[PDB]
């Protein structure tokens, strides 16, 4: 879905596809600015080493220190909305200036 | 999840417990008798990545 830690477009967001009118093909959208995404696994996990054979160790979760919270990623709301505005302008260049891009 | 794991000696077993994610654990039956298996056990061998 999202391309991470790649190259940015030199000038404008680029829309690339093998056939832009063939809906079986993917569209690769290359941003000209990065959108920062902050991902975390907030649980302070332990590691439990179980010997399962001669020198064969299995690494298990064991337990969690503290409470248990859900892993998540944050993005800036304004930066993402600006990025999609640029994406829809470039998509309209292919699908029509008066098309509703959902 | 608690299970009977092998040890360095083939004539000895150990009781081990570990936390697993729901995504990695598949029920064996509908009856909520705590019996579960790893998701891969019916179709694939699983190898541990080197830490």
């Amino acid at each position, epitope marked *: 879905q999202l391309l991470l830690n790649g190259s940015l477009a030199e000038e404008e967001v680029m829309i690339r596809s093998k056939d832009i*009118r*063939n*809906n*079986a093909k993917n569209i690769l959208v290359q941003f000209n600015t990065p959108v920062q995404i902050n991902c975390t696994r907030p649980n302070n996990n332990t590691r439990k080493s179980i010997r399962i054979g001669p020198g064969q160790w299995f690494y298990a979760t064991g337990d969690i220190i503290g409470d248990i919270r859900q892993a998540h990623c944050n993005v800036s709301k304004a930066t993402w909305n600006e990025t999609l505005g640029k994406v829809v302008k470039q998509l309209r260049k292919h699908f029509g200036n008066n098309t509703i891009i959902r | 999840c608690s299970f009977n794991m092998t040890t360095e000696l083939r004539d000895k077993r150990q009781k081990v417990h570990a936390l697993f994610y729901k*995504l*990695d654990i*598949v029920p064996i039956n509908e009856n909520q008798n705590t019996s579960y298996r790893l*998701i*891969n056990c019916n*179709t*694939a061998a699983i190898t541990q990545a080197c830490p």
Partner: nanobody
Amino acid sequence: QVQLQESGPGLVKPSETLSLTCAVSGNPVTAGFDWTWIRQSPGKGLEWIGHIYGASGSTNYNPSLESRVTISRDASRNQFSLKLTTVTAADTAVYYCARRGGDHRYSRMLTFTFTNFDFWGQGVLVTVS
């Protein structure tokens, strides 16, 4: 939610190819769902024919039919279709298209083995004669 509709010839002659197309309204055929074909011979129970996974194009066929069955999708029409070759008298049946579905909360390793055909069409009765 999701509307499936079968369309195709209602009569095929022996040794010809049967081509049935299922139109999907409300859900892309490029979605990671198993788009399936199932048939029911008159007076008999349901028989699964096969499926195509919409997000990759990978297919699976009933081993008794596999050599004569091709399943494909067309994203530009949002259709999927069954191509059943060398039809015989035994192939007369009501053919249904369905969505295997799955559960987005579970890994593909598990939802691959689900038989939760959540959405069904009405079916096409195909007579081989």
